Design a binder for this molecule. Structure first.
Ligand SMILES: Cc1cc2nc3c(=O)[nH]c(=O)nc-3n(C[C@H](O)[C@H](O)[C@H](O)COP(=O)(O)OP(=O)(O)OC[C@H]3O[C@@H](n4cnc5c(N)ncnc54)[C@H](O)[C@@H]3O)c2cc1C
Ligand SMILES: *[C@@H]1O[C@H](CO)[C@@H](O)[C@H](O)[C@H]1NC(C)=O
Ligand SMILES: *[C@@H]1O[C@H](CO)[C@@H](O)[C@H](O)[C@H]1NC(C)=O
Ligand SMILES: *[C@@H]1O[C@H](CO)[C@@H](O)[C@H](O)[C@H]1NC(C)=O
Ligand SMILES: *[C@@H]1O[C@H](CO)[C@@H](O)[C@H](O)[C@H]1NC(C)=O
Ligand SMILES: *[C@@H]1O[C@H](CO)[C@@H](O)[C@H](O)[C@H]1NC(C)=O
Ligand SMILES: *[C@@H]1O[C@H](CO)[C@@H](O)[C@H](O)[C@H]1NC(C)=O
Ligand SMILES: CC1(C)OCc2cc(C=O)ccc2O1
Length: 515
């Protein structure tokens, strides 16, 4: 952990090569175009720029425009803020009826998230069947961590929860570790010890400023193809609504890094997707693939909220309780009168009047899946439909049962006993905001009725379905996808670490292949 970042201001040096998409001089040929300046997109573009001319296209603006994105304290503000179409948080509702958000900003979801940093479960690599260069994976983790990851300071609530998890039998004590392993640990954070947010945008600082150009408020509308099927370029619109073209040249490539929602949307809009679905919308099929926008996953979040009789200190999540069937954390939260959109699954949820502990469990996988479909066959700014089918798979429900029973165990610990309003023997001694924990039937109803998004959604452009083991779109030359659309299961409890790593790792695979 010699390599970890220090406390330091958010580094915006890269703004020297960030331009408004209104600049027509950006139009032309590049070696690489990366669509979406997010978690995977930024480190991929920075890596490619070491040797090649790169255009990164991001639909959102720069984080300096929304200062509440740059601190731990600002986290709530971004979810409370109304979505006017320009804000870094884009609000949506799944067809399941569950409120949710995605990022719309340079840096992607790393600019709005809860900061928790972990490496992938070391078993993930062989699970995929991809021939990963495991030494390069680990060096690439250190390259991310060196830039943006700290060892968090002590926070009283995280220490309480950590003692609780251990007392509740989530063993062993792993101390401070970045690794996803069974047991309780302090993990890394992309919030520094001063509360400054560090994010994927800062990895642009590792790019070559002579080779990397970033266009912001660049809404990529279509992938352009040859007339040997190859991606050749993009159409993108600017904030005034004027259109622009950029192309790749020679052995160059287009990479889509537009996220679980944005990637399948743009593939479908560009005629890459299920023949009968695109034909039904009169979208000309460039490449039939029955799986674009299929196998879209949202790991369930289930939770209780306790209202201690004495104030607790607010904390960022740093302490994790990991089993193979559930991943658990808790945030301590200040009261608010404006709700944090998607913290609770609907807008009709009680407001807290005092500090509360949000105590949560995450279902692994999950095994339930749904799909992304177009709402508009022409306009990328119109959000696609998304459905996750929470708990349609009974293994997911069985796992939520186990998780909720373990949160029961946690509330019974000596660790949590001081946070009860009444010194009675049972967990009815706590005061709850919303529904308290309840044989399995009542745990099942609790799981089904009170599910929220963990925000760790993934899928829609899966390796083995749409992509090969090199992240290439099967049947198309010069087109890759690198982002959370690529895997049907989580790499770990907190996937930003994996997707930051993946952007640079695939960039290095691209540079090697080209040698
Ligand atoms: C509120 C919240 C909290 C979270 N907390 C954590 C946590 O603490 N730790 C953790 O590990 N994970 C966390 N996650 C999950 C994790 O951050 C995400 O899974 C991950 O960042 C996704 O990376 P991505 O590259 O797939 O997408 P993104 O990072 O969202 O990148 C996609 C980018 O593409 C852009 N875009 C989309 N369509 C287009 C288009 N057509 N043209 C141009 N640009 C486009 C978007 O604006 C965006 O910037 C959280 C998620 C949320 C929503
Ligand atoms: C780009 O320029 C337009 C005016 O042409 C302006 O409205 C918009 O805010 C600018 N966006 C950025 C990111 O500078
Ligand atoms: C990669 O790092 C992990 C710790 O994150 C370690 O368990 C593993 O042995 C390393 N693998 C290789 C091939 O070095
Ligand atoms: C597609 O176009 C045909 C005309 O060629 C029309 O009959 C059909 O209704 C159209 N479908 C859609 C969904 O636009
Ligand atoms: C790590 O990954 C493998 C799935 O490949 C799994 O068998 C194991 O449960 C996972 N462990 C944890 C603690 O998530
Ligand atoms: C577009 O979005 C709304 C959800 O807000 C939905 O009711 C409507 O039917 C959608 N249109 C299509 C074609 O899916
Ligand atoms: C759940 O998931 C697996 C696919 O992984 C499948 O075998 C099983 O049939 C599904 N279960 C239910 C209850 O649908
Ligand atoms: C938003 C708030 C209140 O603080 C951060 C937070 C983070 C996780 C991530 O594992 C889950 C829940 C949560 O709650």
């Amino acid at each position: 952990h010699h390599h970890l970042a220090n406390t330091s201001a958010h580094d915006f040096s890269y703004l020297k090569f960030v331009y408004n998409a209104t600049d027509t001089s950006l139009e032309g040929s590049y070696d690489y175009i990366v669509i979406g300046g997010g978690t995977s997109g930024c480190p991929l573009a920075a890596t490619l720029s070491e040797k090649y001319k790169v255009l990164l296209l991001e639909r959102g603006t720069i984080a300096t425009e929304y200062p509440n994105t740059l601190t731990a304290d600002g986290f709530a503000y971004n979810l409370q803020q109304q979505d006017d179409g320009k804000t870094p948080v884009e609000r949506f509702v799944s067809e399941d009826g569950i409120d949710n958000v995605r990022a719309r900003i340079l840096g992607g979801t790393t600019i709005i998230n809860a900061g928790v940093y972990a490496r992938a479960n070391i078993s993930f690599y062989s699970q995929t069947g991809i021939e990963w260069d495991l030494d390069l994976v680990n060096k690439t983790y250190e390259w991310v961590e060196d830039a943006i990851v700290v060892k968090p300071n002590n926070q009283s609530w995280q220490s309480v929860i950590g003692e609780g998890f251990l007392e509740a039998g989530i063993l062993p004590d792993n101390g401070f570790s970045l690794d996803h392993e069974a047991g309780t640990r302090l993990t890394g954070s992309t919030f520094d010890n001063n509360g400054t947010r560090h994010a994927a945008d800062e990895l642009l600082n590792k790019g070559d400023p002579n080779n990397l150009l970033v266009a912001v408020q660049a809404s990529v509308e279509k992938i352009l193809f040859s007339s040997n099927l190859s991606a050749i370029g993009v159409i993108y619109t600017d904030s005034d609504g004027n259109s622009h073209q950029a192309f790749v040249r020679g052995n160059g490539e287009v990479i889509v890094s537009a996220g679980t929602i944005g990637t399948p949307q743009l593939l479908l809009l560009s005629g890459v997707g299920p023949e009968s679905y695109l034909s039904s919308l009169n979208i000309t099929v460039v490449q039939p693939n029955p799986y674009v926008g299929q196998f879209v996953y949202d790991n369930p979040r289930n939770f209780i909220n306790i209202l201690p009789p004495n104030p607790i200190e607010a904390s960022v999540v740093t302490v994790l309780g990991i089993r193979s069937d559930y991943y658990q954390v808790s945030a301590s939260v200040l009261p608010f009168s404006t709700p944090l959109f998607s913290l609770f699954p609907t807008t009709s949820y009680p407001l807290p009047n005092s500090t509360f502990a949000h105590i949560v469990s995450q279902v692994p996988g999950p095994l339930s899946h749904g799909s992304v479909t177009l709402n508009s066959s022409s306009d990328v700014r119109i959000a696609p439909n998304i459905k996750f089918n929470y708990y349609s798979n009974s293994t997911d429900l069985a796992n939520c049962v186990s998780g909720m029973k373990k949160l029961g165990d946690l509330l019974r610990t000596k660790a949590l006993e001081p946070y009860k309003a009444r010194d009675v023997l049972g967990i009815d001694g706590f005061n709850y905001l919303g529904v308290p924990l309840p044989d399995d039937a009542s745990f099942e109803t609790f799981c089904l009725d009170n599910v929220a998004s963990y925000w760790h959604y993934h899928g829609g452009s899966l390796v083995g379905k749409v992509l090969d083991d090199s992240f290439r779109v099967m049947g198309i030359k010069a087109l890759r996808v690198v982002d959370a659309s690529t895997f049907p299961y989580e790499p770990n409890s907190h996937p930003q670490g994996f997707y930051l790593m993946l952007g640079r790792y695939v960039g290095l695979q691209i540079l090697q292949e080209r040698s």
